[model samples]
Target: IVGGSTIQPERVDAAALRQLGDAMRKVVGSADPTPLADLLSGTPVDPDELTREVGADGRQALLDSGMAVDDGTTFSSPLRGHQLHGVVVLSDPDVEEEVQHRWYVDPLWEADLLIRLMLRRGGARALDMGCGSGVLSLVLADRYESVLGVDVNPRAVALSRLNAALNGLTNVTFREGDMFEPAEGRFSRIVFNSPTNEEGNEFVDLLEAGEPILETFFRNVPRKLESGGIVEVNLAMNDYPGDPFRERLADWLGLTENGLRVQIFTSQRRATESGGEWKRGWLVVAPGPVGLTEVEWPYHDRYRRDPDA
Candidate 1:
């Protein structure tokens, strides 16, 4: 608390978050959740409107749970594939921490790519690396016996746990740590939603000098994986003709005889000014050293041709 910023991330209460979820379920959980699309779809809701709908108690729960965004005028609002509901730390990001200033990919696209491109699955354990808002882990909880999400930000850890409760999921848990250190044993699948930065950003200036997270992940992934396990990551890679991202990836796993494999499903270009030297977002699925084989990801043609994506 002593070294924390003035406008710190609000401390979320699990009870409050669950209460909000209960309120929401009451309103929109009827066979059609379409009504929820209006309240929780990343669009802002009028403060008065929210109060009128959820009532003062539920609105108070939204605020105290740390997922409500003010936008200085209550101008914003916003998971799940089917019962895709839960509040992430991004809800708190708008209210606290450095998230308000950081340049990150829209959570919508990130979620879509991770869910759509992934081929790894297990009835055992799954790990969500850099689980910023716990969306992936929550989704995995539906299928896996257990899901563990790790993030460096404490706020992310707390928010993820809160989200698990919000969705009535008992299988997912979260920890605060960098990359793979916090996770032990082995997992059938590991999904990484890596953080992004514009060039010369504050995060790059301060934290990246320690180690390249992507490089470290490849180097250490084999040991933490189950026999037929795999890793999935949605990250931007340096795609210039000189070194090339695909070759560089092999180089990362080059030092190991673990027989790890990399299969990229989506590699779309972006403006250099958008994120930096890394000009493409790659959806990579890297298989573990054991019982390895090949199966190409099925990507739709529209994703490549769509404008305004």
Candidate 2:
């Protein structure tokens, strides 16, 4: 413990703790950004403020709240290079270490490559849907004047707002809105990443819930997009028995001779264990009626692994 703060190392289990350290080493490269020095590195956190801010009763309320703010973008922040500094709310000693891994150390996906494809060529008026911790908000805000992040979770939105302040991004704003609901404005570029598994499946509970929301997203995006605007849909395409996603999303992506042109950008999912198993997904970008094409990813080295190991 440093100063007067005791560490919370006891909260995290062995495997998750190892994953945190290994992921920190891979992503942050030995740079420790703990607010307090003596408290066991990543396990240290601001207790007084978190306790006060969360409030004794409010904490339980937050946990019980029903809002789908889970962001499946699973990528590192481009604004901070390979560094993952999404949130500093490490109040819960029980899962503080694991939270640190997911929020601060795990470079879930290669944001640098995808952002390069998004802004290297220049993008404007971007919308990041379901931005849990406002990572993509920072990426797009750096390039565009108007960047809005929408999520249903209130706490997530609050943390994202805090992150935007941390990065000095006044233009980046986050609000509590369901996907495609309160984003009642048009944008030239729209980027969204949905949650998926190694086999391209969503969680059992979220499958039905995410469907209607996603369908609304596809249907409304075109109406709100510029005449020739672009939409980037990032998701893990499951290779199961049937082409489920295609069948599922085809209705949303209506058939039009002059509809939106979409492209699937490639990037490896975030890796924490020096050489652990990886998750791969596609970044689908498109213009009206152009459909989708696979774009070259910048960080190909991240996914360099043995094929038949």
Candidate 3:
């Protein structure tokens, strides 16, 4: 949920959102995309021009679905079309400090990074835990037989379903629940975009008191995963004092009892930004029957060097 947002997910019509996706496709095939690019990137474009492309009702679908904002004259959108990945996601470019959005977060870049690191030969099912805009699931659907996206925020679930509809992907489904609650049986792969506490000393306090979200994930995820499964997580980690960074991470991820050994990497996620205090961290945890191919990782420090040890 976006801190204090007025938008209602239940009230948001799924049929209307699918129409909006159709409108986007109409715009994509139009003669000139100068206005379309402008609209997608948050710059206002002539509503009349959009109306000409997608029809009056189609244009209205974009507006009603919160995919576009209509002023009297110009219309714009916060939703971004990642051409490289072929997914349209709702993550506002210009961020506001006052209205903090916890669920609908940014940068289609991190999702891309995870996709690159993902296993080539995917199995039956894949789980995109905390699937904000369903960007990860949209990509994973191609590799896996089917993909299930789980998010705690209902708004995220609704919008992610909209995205799946937008992509015409029948294999993707979005459910609202914390972590693995909605995920049934076991998955060949689980991808999580870990949320970092970015506020002042609040992270330090959470670390001291024990960060519940990551703690909950590390505690419960093992059994939910298939025997030869792989878990990919990308997050912004705090540079806490006392122990080495890996030691602190191991504590939070519960490596000791969980028998979790990670292959680490570096990449900027959402607003974790380039040149910030928070470290861009990536981890690949393959347990039991899995011994995956070693991909790219610059910062390769680990609590357990030998997975056997």
Candidate 4:
């Protein structure tokens, strides 16, 4: 989950980041993003695909190479007007280091929505599936009895633990494992905001890799929940009005021999800041179907009451 708005030194390389951003602007500014529609039309999006990565040490070496400096802290982006006093844990090393290093900024929308949903539902056991930097893990820990942040990357789990200690939050924990493997017992609520396949092919690769992840989530969540528990799935999809995700989700959610009651609710959202956008669909699945109400808490005024009210 994003933390703050002000740009942090970690989020951007200042000179280098601006250069890259500018280059991207020139490139995308010159062409229409619509041409990307070719693949969405007929290409089968695979969920089981994987990416090649040198081991963690090699990857870290490559990531650290040619960098101007390495900040001791993991997070480059620091949120203003927010304190780490109660933050529980972070999920990824990159997310933690980025926050610690002051590289980028945070967007409070995800945290706000997550908290709002929990407060409304009165849930106590919460799970953050892809708890990048453990922002949501800490936030949920404030109200829930316990919060668990799960990630596949070891670096991220380590960074998240450091972040938790930095914030002095002990009720939250971060574990390393793919999706639900590390999760134990049922949670009242599970939060997931996965990567949308838009950050070039790498993002697409991640989306393709998410197939089994999604299946595992579906299968394991029933065992992880109480009688009325629910899963909050945040998916970034290729939205061309009527997209396949909507229909496909119906099938996926219904594949519940695990005692889950699946109901899918969906919506669209912009993928990028500029003219580019992707459809973000949300699925609130539970052991039983639950009614959904939506409210858009814009970044401008964060304290506003829920629009759904």
Q: How accurate is candidate 2 locally (lDDT)?
A: 0.47
Q: Which parts of model 2 have CA positions greater than 4 angstroms off?
A: 1-41, 45-119, 198-213, 239-244, 265-280, 293-309
The CA lDDT at 26 in model 4 is: 29
Candidate 3 residue pairs that clash: none
Q: Each model's RMSD to truth, in Å?
A: 6.7, 12.5, 7.4, 16.0
In TM-score terms, candidate 2 sits at 0.57
Q: Residue by residue across 1-309, what tens digits does model 1's lDDT show?
A: 111112112354556556666656554435543323345645566778777766676666665554454576663443221233332323321232244433221244446545655664566999998776677887788779999998776656766676677776678888888778899899988887766533322246212312267777776777777865767776656655455656656666652456666666545545454343453344444544422232333343444565223
Against the hidden reference, what TM-scores do the models get?
0.67, 0.57, 0.72, 0.52
Best by lDDT: 3
Model 4 agreement with the true structure over 1-309: per-residue lDDT tens digits: 332222122332234333322222322223332111111122221211100222233223212321112234221212211222333222212244233422222223355444444334546788888775566676666677888998765544544554454345567788888778798888887887664434422423332344455555655665677777767776554434344444444444454344455544334456554444455445666544333333343422332544333
Task: Give the per-residue lDDT digits (tens) of candidate 3, residues 1-309.
Answer: 232222333334566556655556545534666566568766788988877766687677676666677777888776665543555555444355445455445445356555655666678899998787688898888878999999877767776777787666779998988678789999888888776545423433211222456667766667777766878877555544443345655666565666655666654333333333455667788754222232334432322253211
Estimate candidate 4's RMSD in Å: 16.0
Question: Would you give me the overall lDDT of model 3?
Answer: 0.63
Count clashing pairs, candidate 2: 21
- Of 2 and 4, the candidate ahead on TM-score is 2
Q: Write the per-residue lDDT of candidate 2 for residues 48-71, one digit (tens) a residue.
A: 432343343322222222100112
Q: What is the number of backbone collisions in each predicted candidate, taken in the order shown? A: 4, 21, 0, 42
> What are the runs in model 4 whose C-alpha is more than 4 Å off?
1-119, 122-124, 199-212, 238-243, 255-278, 286-309
Show where candidate 3 strays beyond 4 Å: 1-32, 94-104, 107-109, 197-210, 238-261, 266-278, 287-296, 299-309
